[PDB]
Amino acid sequence: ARSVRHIAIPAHRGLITDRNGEPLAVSTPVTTLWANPKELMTAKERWPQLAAALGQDTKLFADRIEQNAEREFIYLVRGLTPEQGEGVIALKVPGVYSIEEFRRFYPAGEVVAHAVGFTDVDDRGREGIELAFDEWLAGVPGKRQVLKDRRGRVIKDVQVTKNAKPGKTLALSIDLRLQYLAHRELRNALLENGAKAGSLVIMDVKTGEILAMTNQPTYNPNNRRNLQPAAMRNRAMIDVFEPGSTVKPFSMSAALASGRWKPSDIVDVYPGTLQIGRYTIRDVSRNSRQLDLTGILIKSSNVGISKIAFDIGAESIYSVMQQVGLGQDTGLGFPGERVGNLPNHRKWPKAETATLAYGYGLSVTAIQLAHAYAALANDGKSVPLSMTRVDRVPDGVQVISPEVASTVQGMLQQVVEAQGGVFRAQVPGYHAAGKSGTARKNAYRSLFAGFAPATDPRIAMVVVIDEPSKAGYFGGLVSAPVFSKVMAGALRLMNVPPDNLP
Ligand SMILES: *C(=O)[C@@H](NC(=O)[C@H](C(=O)O)c1ccsc1)[C@@H]1N[C@@H](C(=O)O)C(C)(C)S1
Ligand SMILES: [Ca+2]
């Protein structure tokens, strides 16, 4: 006859912005149309006009109502624009009611899809920052009393028992200007090399802020109809890999901290191979005998780093990679975020000791690698990672001694600047530093990791490109130029003064 019931007042989801207030995810009013079927069933002459307005076949529409005749609630359509919800309401069909809902719009679309993420049908986080800060963004549903007749018809609008609590604004650490650049250059690099995937992370070495995170492939999160799982993967945070030679700078920090090695020390890498039981450590270029520690990094000698590893022990190298966060929790609390793995031993056999030293048998992500490189560039101090704007920087942890970190920084500027090094990584007007890699996954993963300006580091960057299909596949040929192009732009967009001066 008369029953009081309660309907949910859905809340506004919080505005996401970039670090400078550029909107990245904006809650847009939509209209969900619902029908009371037992009510519809006394205005059957209206159904054809409604079916046609909802773009439905007349008999399919009528069978639907006639099927659910005993029900008092069916959805007609969720999430129409107001201008098409209202056009249906305008037919005045007895028992057709409307709900002002919210649906997300992403003004930057595919450029920042993986980082900002995606909302499900109920407007809840499903991916990236939407899933991570879902509780902060979500607000809380309101609650409204409704007097209902014995047919399921709304007798009245009684009195809201609770108010909708709207979710809060979130400013990302991401700089849309650097994100756009990182997106564009990584996309050009994929198509130019005919590669399958790629990731590029830009970090602030002083604050722990992620300034850009892009992956190929990506997707338009405004196109809800054809989600392909592959193109929605935030590769930077969920796709693990062996970092290969890009961990050699950590093996070297272990060596310089041991008390057993200085940069002017020599290793004999003749004849470019080294047998270790039934495994052969192999150098790409094999016309070397004596190399200085700096030369081992410039030539990327696997034998060279392996010999240093046999002398200092795997434990010292494991402990550096552990301290800088390789295969360790990032703390970022993105669900489904993979941590990869750092293998441990009580007794390190010779083979595992060598492969660790040149980055095999560990699995890391592009965000971990960028974070280790940020700790090296910021004088051996690791600042906690952040995907939201940092106004008050937390205390960092000293993970490599400042003198060792400074010495490895210099060796990495020679890797970029010296005869025979990775010249494609050179950032005109600046001193740049870092290290190439190329991992057998014949198909390859092309890596460059570094930071700039060398004289006072501000930015760390990782570029990873999976299976370039042109003739050049070395990280130094494929990823270095991307790091170069994006670094030139990123430093200039940050008004970092060019440091290649007298
Ligand atoms: C480090 O990544 C290391 N790569 C290799 O040794 C690869 C392997 O495991 O055999 C390799 C060798 C030729 S293609 C892949 C050295 N660093 C690389 C780099 O700096 O790009 C290298 C290709 C110079 S060898
Ligand atoms: Ca410094």
Q: In terms of domains, do 207 and 259 share one?
A: no
- Asked whether residue 137 is domain-assigned, the answer is yes
Residue 42 lies in a domain: yes
Are residue 71 and residue 84 in the same domain, yes or no?
A: yes
**271: preceding bond cis by omega (within 30 degrees):** yes
Q: Distance between CA atoms of 209 and 46, rounded to whole angstroms?
A: 58
Q: What is each CA distance from 440 to 239, 251, 351, 473, 475, in whole angstroms?
A: 16, 20, 17, 11, 12
Pairing of strands 2-7, 143-149: antiparallel
CA–CA separation, 134 vs 431, rounded Å? 41
Distance of CA 95 to the CA centre of its chain: 46
Picking from 367, 387, 417, the residue at the C-terminal end of a domain is 417
Does one domain contain both 293 and 384? Answer: yes
- How far is ligand 2, taken at its centre, from the CA of residue 252, in Å? 18
What is 91-114 written as a DSSP string? T--TTEEEEEEEEEE-TTGGGSHH
Q: Are residues 202 and 322 in the same domain?
A: no
| Distance (Å, whole) CA 214 – CA 128 | 12
Shared domain check, 38 and 155: yes
Task: Quote the strand ranges of 379-495, DSSP E.
Answer: 381-382, 397-398, 433-440, 444-452, 459-466
* Beta-carbon contacts of residue 55 (< 8 Å; ≥ 6 apart): none
Resolution (A): 1.9
* Separation between Cα atoms, residue 417 and residue 410, nearest integer Å: 10
Active site residue 301: no
The response to whether residue 437 sits with its C-beta less than 6 Å from ligand 1 reads: yes
Measured at the CA of 336, the angle between CA 188 and CA 378, to 5 degrees, comes to 65
> Per the structure block, which two tokens stand in for 78?
């969720």
Domain carrying residue 191:
174-220+418-502
Instruction: Give me ligand 2 centre to Cα 332, in Å.
Output: 26
Cβ neighbours of residue 86 closer than 8 Å, sequence gap 6 or more: 31, 98
Distance of alpha carbon 451 from alpha carbon 458, whole angstroms: 7
Q: Residue 383 and residue 445: Cα distance in Å, rounded?
A: 28
- What is the residue whose two structure tokens read 């450590």? 281
Smallest-distance ligand from the CA of 408: 2
Amino acid sitting at position 299:
K
| Domain membership flag for residue 225 | no
Atom of ligand 1 nearest to the CA of 473: 14
- Which of the listed residues 242, 245, 364, 369 should we mutate to test ligand 1's pocket, taking the one with most ligand atoms within 8 A of CB? 245
Cα(358) to ligand 1 centroid in Å equals 9
User: Is the CB–ligand 1 distance for residue 249 below 6 Å?
Assistant: no
State the Cα–Cα distance between residues 46 and 194, nearest whole angstrom. Answer: 56
The token pair at 145 is: 């009393």
Closest CA to ligand 1's atom 14: 438
Pocket test for ligand 1, best of 415, 436, 438 (most atoms within 8 A of CB): 438
Domain check: are 299 and 388 in the same one? yes
How many Cα atoms sit within 13 Å of 326 on the Cβ side?
30
Looking at the structure, tell me whether residues 30 and 159 fall in a common domain: yes
Amino acid at site 468: P
Residue 228 within any structural domain of the chain: no
Pair of tokens at residue 209: 């802020």
Closest CA to 417 of 434, 399, 398: 434
Q: Is the CB of 301 under 6 A from ligand 1?
A: no
Which ligand minimizes its atom distance to the CA of 443? 1
- Specify whether 146 is located in the same domain as 212: no
What SS3 state is found at 481?
A: helix
> Which of 394, 417, 440 is the C-terminal boundary of a domain?
417
Tell whether 87 and 165 lie within a shared domain. yes
Same domain, 364 and 430: no
Out of 417, 447, 473, pick the residue that ends a domain.
417
In a domain, 313, yes or no: yes
Assess contact for 104 and 117: CB atoms under 8 A: no
Q: Whole-angstrom Cα distance, residue 72 to residue 187?
A: 51
Query: Rounded CA gap, 81 and 123, in Å?
Result: 15
Joined tokens for residue 276: 């270790």
d(CA 286, CA 155) in angstroms, rounded, equals: 87
Q: Domain with 440 in it: what CATH number?
A: 3.30.450.330
**Single-letter amino acid code for the residue at 104:** R
Q: Which of 27, 173, 199, 245 is catalytic?
A: 245
380 lines ligand 1 (CB under 6 A): no
Q: Give the separation between CA 274 and CA 283, rounded to whole angstroms.
A: 9
| β-pair partners for 77 | 33
Helix (H) or strand (E) holding 76: strand 74-80
**In this structure, what is the dihedral angle of CA atoms 330, 332, 336, 339, given to the nearest 10 degrees?**
0
CATH number of the domain at 373, please: 3.40.710.10
Q: How far is CA 368 from CA 164, 220, 326, in A?
A: 39, 26, 6
Q: Which two tokens stand for residue 318?
A: 């494991």
Indicate the burial class of 43 (C-beta count within 10 angstroms; 0-12, 13-18, 19 or more).
middle
CA dist list (Å): 383 to 250, 338, 339: 17, 20, 18
Determine whether the shortest distance from the Cβ of 244 to ligand 1 is under 6 A. yes
Do the Cβ atoms of 329 and 365 come closer than 8 Å? no
**Counts of helices then strands in the chain (DSSP H, E):** 18, 21
Helical spans, DSSP H, in 210-247:
235-238
328: nearest Cα among 258, 240, 401, 400: 240
Between CA 441 and CA 48 the distance in angstroms is: 60
Q: Which of helix, strand or coil describes residue 201?
A: strand
Return left, alpha or beta for 325; rule: phi > 0 is left, psi -120 to 50 is alpha, else beta.
Answer: left
Query: Residue 227 falls within a domain, yes or no?
Result: no
Is 474 close to ligand 1, i.e. is its CB under 6 Å away? Answer: yes
Residue 229, in any domain of the structure = no
| Ligand with minimal distance to 304 CA | 1
Residues 311, 351, single domain; the answer is yes
Q: Are 425 and 412 in contact (CB under 8 A)?
A: no
Determine if ligand 1 sits within 6 Å of the CB of residue 302.
yes
Q: Which ligand is nearest to the CA of 354?
A: 1
Pick the residue whose CA is nearest to atom 18 on ligand 1. Answer: 437
Distance of CA 381 to the CA centre of its chain: 23
Helices 176-193, 480-493: crossing angle, 10 deg rounding: 160
How large is the angle between the packed helices 248-258 and 302-312, nearest 10 degrees? 40
Residues 6+ apart with CB under 8 A from 165: 11, 139, 140, 142
Among residues 425, 418, 429, 430, the alpha carbon closest in space to that of 446 is found at 425
For residue 188, what are the contacts with CB-CB under 8 A and spacing of at least 6?
Answer: none
CB 414 within 8 A of CB 431: no
Residue labelled with tokens 């961990």 = 247
* Ligand 1 site, residue 47, Cβ cutoff 6 A: no
Residues 138 and 178 in one domain: no
Å from CA of 282 to ligand 1 middle? 9
For residue 132, which amino acid is it? Answer: A
- φ, ψ at 290 (rounded to 5°): -80, 125
Q: Using what technique was this structure determined?
A: X-ray
Is residue 111 domain-resident?
A: yes
Q: How many structural domains does the chain have?
A: 3
